[model samples]
Target chain A: ASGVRIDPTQTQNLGVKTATVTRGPLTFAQSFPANVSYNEYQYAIVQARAAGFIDKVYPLTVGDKVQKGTPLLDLTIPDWVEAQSEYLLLRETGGTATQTEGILERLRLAGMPEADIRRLIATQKIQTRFTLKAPIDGVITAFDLRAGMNIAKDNVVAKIQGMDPVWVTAAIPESIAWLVKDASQFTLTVPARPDKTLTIRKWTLLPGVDAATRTLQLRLEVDNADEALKPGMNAWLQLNTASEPMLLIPSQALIDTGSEQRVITVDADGRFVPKRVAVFQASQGVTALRSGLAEGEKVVSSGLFLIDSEANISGALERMRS
Target chain B: ASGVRIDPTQTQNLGVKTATVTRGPLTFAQSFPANVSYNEYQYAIVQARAAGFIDKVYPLTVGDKVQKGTPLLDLTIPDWVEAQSEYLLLRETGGTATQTEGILERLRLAGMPEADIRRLIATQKIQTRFTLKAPIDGVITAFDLRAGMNIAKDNVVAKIQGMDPVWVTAAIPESIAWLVKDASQFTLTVPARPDKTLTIRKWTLLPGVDAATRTLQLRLEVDNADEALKPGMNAWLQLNTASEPMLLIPSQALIDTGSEQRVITVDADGRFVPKRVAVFQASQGVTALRSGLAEGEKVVSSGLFLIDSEANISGALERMRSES
Candidate 1:
């Protein structure tokens, strides 16, 4: 389409600038500096199995290669000695299904990998120096087991990365929960590694929020089977939705309240107008106009807070009630 | 405090209605219809302590008194059998502080009563048939244990209803977590049994949560040390907060988005104005208003939403941008 160019000198006589209005998706994008942690599905803080004395350890040092079912420790504790005898006694009873399967199931429920317990069941025999296998097949980032050391039950032995399905847990305020409530999927991009954008195939909303933080946890799972992502790494993640029509405007276009979530809009003449806007979920540099705004309306997002202060200072914002 | 009422018949005539605006605690009460559940501290689902074939089943059915450390079943399970052998062997190895303490600890972790394990340690020999003692003294509620029946590890053999500290779990919506976030205590009273309110002496925020329900599980430990409350009985719980001033308006004086909050106030010329107000909470018919309307503001408490509909129909409520 051919566009008309405005002659500044000739247009000055007319007092109008050449303008074009086009239709596009309301691509409201927000990028916050964030850190990546173990996706719950791929994260396991392997605890000491059965209060044992660590006799031998695998993944000898931190950052060692440990495969799923890899022996993380050979614990020689009396508890194992007792369990071994019990299993042997049960074994003597013509090959019976021991209650040890229940133990394995309980461990799995507590976020342990099923593969480790599967190996134990396949053998059907309890070893004297009981081997505590790595629950996940990844580099052991933490090793809490040592030779001749008695670790308590439920004590974290090692943290194996779930390399296949990695998850990054992020905190979103209660106000934003509505927008992403039924959002089945989202794209998470790490700023440090822009080339790789992880598609969040699964989302688990965290309940019983941390009151102090006023933020609800949103767990986004990404398939990282190669195991390149590590926990405790700082990264910026952008939760992008399919672009829907939204009121996008400059940060200077809002009438805001000191209390979060309330923002107002102004008429063309700049009157203080009260508007209830969901501004909780917004980028630092720019705010995504979620609701209570139309596309063409002008807002004082930047001077809104300031205008609020001045209005309160001089009794301008307060509507006089008779 | 004396309140003056302006008469509607005359412009200047006045009559006092003697409305009492008492500044006492106006608890924003909400009745969440919840059924009573087993008080955890007072009751527990009885499970087989040891993995074993049920050697002999208890004749006592549900609602039978089980004394503390009494044998619920004689399991033929492998782990519990090994535990008995170890407890017997540990008698010569010294006491709880010994290296064999790990064995006792594991059994205890696996739900074995310490007193029974300790008793075996004191006796210097393991008992035959492997008697699994009751963890607490309570009435048996679920006795699934049967003679010669092999039960799995997670199998529930019998439930003991010491029911000392009964817990009533209420599924509060994720929206209302803010109000009871720091609630120090909760008063529970069943609607069917509203005569008394059982107070939770203490509580622990369950670390895990129900992801599907979008609700947090709060394990409240009720003080049923005297054993007053029963399981499966319904109760009403009043979760209270410190007394503070809240904006109160009649139930009709609000606009609602079905799920979102609401309130409406009249402007200077008696024109109705619909407002999106944060309702801190509500109970009965009155709403505890948040930072929207002010005190003594004329809000049309009755039929405000209906009036708003009429105003919209009459074009009295300005659609500022649309009209312009």
Candidate 2:
């Protein structure tokens, strides 16, 4: 109950004001410089099913938007045609169903496309050429397919990068790396789409930390269905965390003396008493207390240091008298 | 959400005991070794008023108790008799009341006790020998009132140290010196009075610090009007401080990792989450939280390290997956 007694007039003269210790969610937000990238996990690679000459190309270029089943190129393979003809000859010679099934399975193992096999079964004829289609909705990243160019089996034809759900990579410091969690919501703004804020729902921890930056790489899945965000675009990721209700006061109310932290609270008698408090976390101009204060209590927020200077004088006088 | 999740059965198997975060006063008690001393401010000194032979001294000695007006000695002063005779002769004469009052005042001022002057004036007689009495209630600390020793003016007769209210001096560490304040209640126990505890209601900071011990000297005013406590008695000053209601949990519930402090709380889904918290202060076996906990919530108190070890392992697994 011992404290510095400031008359109401003196309090007004000093411009001292009080703020209530409120109970509410403590929200903290941190922004990290980020960049847009393709979600590598969603990427798909297109290759030649069999050694053949590229009969035609879709005339598509890098960065061209494409969807699943969108044809990228067409190729003809003579070996696949020969294998299909031999299967038909065996079927005409009264080969067992097991034998036909075995040859059909061999035909698939020999790099014939599923659509080609289905067409042959439906028409009872061999088809030599097949069109390669996109496996996912994305933009074509690599396309070396050209007419009259021979393609070896399994050779790269094109690489499709998914764009509907692009990846936003951010490097967070080790101190707050724990905030990155799967499914945590994040808001990101790309330079290309400055007017729009994209909300990302899913986040994944990337494979490594930067040795020089001492930061953990976080991958956030962002919705770019409109293709407003593209690969290599600079971005900023903002995250806000909400916690349970806590007693929070203005950050200015606390006097941090390196060795101790205290706040001056106005009791019922209007006397300002310096009370030590524990700072849980400080953010957004407010500090949450772990102890030493109660909800609904009023503390001097503005003009605290002025009041503290007077309190220090008062304490000095008491010490002198003692 | 990123904490160790223990199976309910495993939690029970570990024998971890959880306690609810309670609201109560954070009480802390500290005891300081102290000793009693006379209230120096209340002490008084008695001295001889005239050069005279100590004709008769009371059987008073150091440590003897006395009160106001108690006889201490009887002295006969030849010079004092001559002054008294002059004063009585003036009174016997038909002098004006003002003249008589002037001589009586002179007699009273000339080392004559009030009782002696009053008696002389009433009888119109001269009395040389006078008995000295105690001026206050206290014990004789210094006395050399000899029966036959000739004394000069201002000779030491007795030194009385008051015993109504005494002082208890304590040395408190500089770190917690701020806790000492005026009018703060303190409990003291003395070896001389082992069966009783004295409550001191006033405390004052002494004007200096112990250079070697790095401590501040504090003085507590103890009421000993009954004279039950004496000076120089060894005492222990006890003080307990209680603060406002705070969220209190067992001390063992905290996991202090030098860089961070946390506690494992059972969430609504019964999963233990290692939550960072700030410790305001601790006492006895409980710790008061400044934040990061709520009242009525349960925290792992006993076997917390076992739970923390599991959480560490969980974090390690998470780090490993990220590394891959």
Over A159-189, each residue of candidate 1 has an lDDT whose tens digit, in order, gives: 6654456557665554444455556565676
Model 2 CAPRI quality:
incorrect
Q: Write the per-residue lDDT of candidate 2 for residues A1-322, one digit (tens) a residue.
A: 3233322222333555789899876676788888888765455557665577888888687878888888888888888787898788877898888788767866764556567888988888998777888877877787776777888743557677676777778876544432353226878777777676867676655423454565656676766767778888899888788766778999988877533577877788776666778776666789878788988888888433445535443332122110
TM-score of chain A of each: 0.51, 0.63
**lDDT minimum window of 10 residues, candidate 2 chain B:** B315-324
What DockQ, on C-alphas, does every prediction get? 0.01, 0.00
Best by TM-score: 2
Candidate 1, what DockQ? Answer: 0.01
For model 1, the superposed segments whose C-alpha errors exceed 4 Å read A1-27, A42-59, A69-136, A141-161, A208-213, A240-322, B1-324
Model 2 interface root-mean-square deviation: 53.2
Clash count for each candidate, listed in order shown: 30, 5
